[model samples]
Target: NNPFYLRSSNSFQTLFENQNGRIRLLQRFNKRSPQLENLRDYRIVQFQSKPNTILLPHHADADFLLFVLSGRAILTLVNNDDRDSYNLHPGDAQRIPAGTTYYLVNPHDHQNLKIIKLAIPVNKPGRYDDFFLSSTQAQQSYLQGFSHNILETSFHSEFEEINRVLLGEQRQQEGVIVELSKEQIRQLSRRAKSSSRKTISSEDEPFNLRSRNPIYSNNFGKFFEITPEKNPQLRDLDIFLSSVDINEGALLLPHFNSKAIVILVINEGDANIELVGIEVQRYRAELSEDDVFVIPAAYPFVVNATSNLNFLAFGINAENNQRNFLAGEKDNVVRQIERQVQELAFPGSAQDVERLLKKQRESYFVDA
Candidate 1:
């Protein structure tokens, strides 16, 4: 009855779709599965936009941690009279606070912009809504719900002018996401540069995971991470984001998180994954790109890269988390165990157990 793995096809629900782009969200786990209750507060989403497309101005009732998986993006966030725009590329990660008005543009001319986001619902534990600023045929603007007089008074404009300027006439035929011509994209880029303010702090800027040296690296792989300590924007959420790139046939030695539950998104390649948890039961899977999986707190898991596996992970309840490795020359918890305990636990000679545990000289990464 393990529900740790989620196939991309069966676990995702299309939240929005059009010729220009689409948004797919991972379906929430069954509430009856008590083990998944922690995951209910969070949501994983995949957003794909064709080249030269805009994901319109909107605000969500949840905080978002967004990472660019591929292509480029121009993200603009509005804060009353001030506006901040960020240039995002593959491996870039950003945090968007709840109710923050923002928009995204896929500015590339050829490649599609692909983004993955971990959303933490604010209003409801497991629910959130996107409030688009402009009215469209598929959805109405939150402002449109107000009475005509109130709208006019708020904007200091008449109904007709408001309708023409704010409530776009052409928007009635377009969805929230719309394709833009090359000229339009150029103009938008220019405007963004012209209106860009320099008031943004470093904490608000996007972090590039791939651009930096790995936190842990060996001949076989590298690990990149963004924790609250590294990015203050994530402090409130107590979450951490990390990416792992392992060479083909390399093994990421078994390890367990002391506090965090890791939600992994397979970005590229394939791997043989195994996990052991409650009741000493084990879970195994063959994971490939686009697949999603979860590793519960204190559950030991290992990854054997079948084809240069790479994955992105969002860890919740991570403030106090620590990686307790079970195998390796260094950081191996088993090595730290007393010889007497090792012998008793394994029903073997203390010296034999020590030799077996010490045989693997490499830590974290070893050839599978």
Candidate 2:
């Protein structure tokens, strides 16, 4: 099967907000892949916030990988009694456990923060609940469902104060991204260092966007790939996520995964994807920023960037690492074989076979 598609910017349902910006999400329920019925809790959310805003503690029915696309923040995750704090910067990432209470904020004064969250929903397949202690706007937070007496006496707080704090902050817009005053920023400053947290992927390069992606090419584009071995935290995750950054007019090359079905979320730019269909016929899809596409396991395909493209993709089969390729490598299956295999496959002389298969040896990323 191929992939389900959604234009996040245009199709998103309001998950949280105020007038400045909001937290929005889109889950994969449109056309569930039959091949992944046992593992299709896939969802993506974008949190766009103004500087120095603190999101209240909340939990969801799913576990997710929190990836920072831009800005700085402090990420605090609490699982039972275990708590960890991360000072996050652009390109940082952390794995937040399901049902855990956590929150983060953009600590900077001027810049906005953008985070891309990849989640595998649990229990509920299509929509996941955001259980927050408080919400300024949008729907009421979970705390409103509790009895007033229980909330007041349990926290030893005034019933009136509790009621006002939980329900009084009506916003002008249905959804709002909080913008904090300097005083508010100061209140949170003591909670963590001004220094921000970082992730293992992009900042991994600490050099540039491409050099640190681990798996990349100037020829086609850049992508950060993960194996079970590379990210041990993912050993428990049936799914894995990676980043792709490509310049215009690069080819992702033709390859197939023997053990993973992939879905790509285009964060920015555009691309054309070519995939081998069920009957072995080829099909193509045009994808732009905020769109998604699917790739079935073991199906050969290639992608060409239409503009400066950036995307994130995830898949199952954390253990099977076989990537059968048909382009851009010295060991391309048919060409890597003996001279007899190469010549017979091409039906030509050594020079002809070389012309057919020999080109750039860049394996992971290839420029056209």
Candidate 3:
């Protein structure tokens, strides 16, 4: 018999060369099943970029959870409808909606960009689908129906500036001093150095668009450990969790399988989770720790300890049941409570019950 005390020892790493000028390190969790079967279907792809490389505009198949491992890059999310853009920095995790267009660029000429991306499938058995709008014939449509006079007067100079920047001939210094040419750079250098503005406050709006908060709570506790055979489903994933005191550090492991979504409910504690590139949502459900929440499939989600208290986590892969586990005795009680709620909310009268029972008569089970 497999020992309950045994823990997973699976580990593997690989490198992928992107069509663009970037390298990705792909790491898989340790386990014997090929293609992370127990996870539902998930992969962690970490990207590393050299200085001066262009991180192009693109979209991802499922939603993405991005973590800033090191270095820095300028991230821009352009509203497809209005073309408005929002910028972000390190330690920020953004939940980029799937199919939305966005771009990341190494604005610094001498610094590299390193980031870890957890690709969580919105739907199980998902594939990476990407498109480049700038390279398609749609470009002509954006420029059509322009009056020659307005185009020449109002757009010519702006278009030239954009072209210069895209062609690597210009850089914005503090949102000013457009470094268009060597002469301009020299002229700007001769002027007295202006003090940088500190107008932006830390309490400013966190994100431009309305998004769901990824964090569940921060007032409860977490417990972490490798334990024995109380949970059989964990055997496939080679991990185990035993009862422990509250307030320990617990890692939220999300696998891609059934529908590429896995959700973790924070039973107790305040915690912050990293979702995608420099985007994070903090959850503070002080009284809701006893509740369960979902991390959509194929989307990367993580939980970090924030308080000193005990909490419980339940892992469910909408994709596969082999690696799924239901923990905590309180959860069973909650189910019973939920059943009672449903029964009260939709109690069937005698006539309704008879009709429902009559439908069952149309179906029969056969004994083999």
Candidate 4:
């Protein structure tokens, strides 16, 4: 019996791209990686930006938790008519709460910016609406849906003034990112750039994930984990991050999480992931930096570094970040179960079950 491999019909697509000063690539996987299951709780999106580009202002019901994969960017969140901004680099993460207006800018002159975003749904399903604040038409504005009297009364403005700002725009396609005009370009360049090494809130110290290696290591591999204990600001959407890397021909062991479902973002090399669905079917996926694979919480799975190993990944959890190992006698959940309890479920003796489970000498990560 085998489980199903959640696959994608497409990879990343471009919203806008160019040579002079911009690039915008977006992957909206609202439904597929077995993606539909994820939509029950959140939506996953991947975005990239070349130096000096702007992702226009937008808002959605889902809060966005952003993980920077590479490069740097400046983030702006506007709410209650106030602006709160932050700078993010690789290994750093931040969140934009639901119904908040926000945009991102890649200010560097050379490096490209990449981020993996988790859009946790507030009350939506496999679908959520993304509304752009600056648009030509179609998704014009919330004001467009109202009467002129209501629009004018709410803002204490006459029809003409309201019409110009709220209902006005150049005839252009409403894409995700845009190039800056000469005026805005000049204004932006004049703005001072600050070092990301200072303090503010969560980002004051920057997570600095790249410099944090796996706490546990051996001849086989190492692992790193970050929970609220490390950064107390992660309570929004109850988030956590875990990183894993195994050496040549090694394995990260078979395990299942107790509380959090894992969305694995492959960072380097190749890995073979095998999992067992609730129906007792097995599923396998061959993943490179080529694609992402999702594993439902509590699903038993094994990860093996293939193509001569060299595997690495950074993962984020939805909530309940606690993970439990199910392999290796030293750490397996089966080892915790009493011998008679396991014996009743197995065809062989309890001791035999122990022998099969105990075959692996190491727990966290080990060689085959």
Whole-model lDDT values for every prediction: 0.84, 0.67, 0.36, 0.63
lDDT of 1 by residue, 1-368 (tens): 34888889788888889988899988785452667987889888999999998988999999999989999888889998888877887888888988999999999989999899998889888788899987887788888889999988999998999988677645474788988888877866764431112312246777777666777789999888877666666666788889988999997899999999899999999998999976488899888889988999989999889998889999888896898999888788888988889889997799989889878888888887
In candidate 1, the residue pairs with backbone N, CA or C atoms under 3 Å apart (3 or more residues apart, or in different chains) clash, namely none
**Better model by TM-score: candidate 2 vs candidate 3:** 2
| Candidate 3 accuracy as lDDT | 0.36
Better of 1 and 3 by lDDT: 1
Among residues 3 or more apart in sequence or in different chains, the pairs in candidate 4 whose N, CA or C atoms overlap within 3 Å are 2-282, 3-281, 3-282, 6-34, 32-35, 199-204, 214-223
The 10-residue segment with the lowest total lDDT in model 1: 193-202
Give the poorly placed runs of model 2, Cα more than 4 Å off: 1-3, 9-11, 29-39, 78-83, 148-158, 164-176, 190-213, 218-220, 337-355, 359-364
Q: What TM-score should be assigned to candidate 2?
A: 0.81
Q: In angstroms, how far off is 350's CA in candidate 3?
A: 58
- Per-residue lDDT of candidate 2, residues 1-368 (tens digit): 33444555555766666755577776554544455464456777888888777676778888877777778777777677766666667655566778888877677888888887777777877557777755545557777777888888787898888666556644332443455677766666565522221323322211112224446545566667665554555556755667777788776778887778776778778899888866367768788877777777877888788888887776766476566778866336766778876667666987777776766657756665
> Where does candidate 1 stray beyond 4 Å?
30-32, 156-158, 168-173, 190-201
Rank by TM-score (best first) = 1, 2, 4, 3
User: If scored against the real structure, what TM-score would every candidate get?
Assistant: 0.92, 0.81, 0.35, 0.73
If both were scored by TM-score, which would come out higher, candidate 2 or candidate 4? 2
**Poorest lDDT segment (10 consecutive residues) of candidate 2:** 202-211
Candidate 4, residue 36: how far the Cα is off, in Å: 7.0
After superposition, which runs of candidate 3 have C-alpha atoms over 4 Å from their true positions?
A: 1-20, 25-36, 123-126, 134-368
Top lDDT model: 1
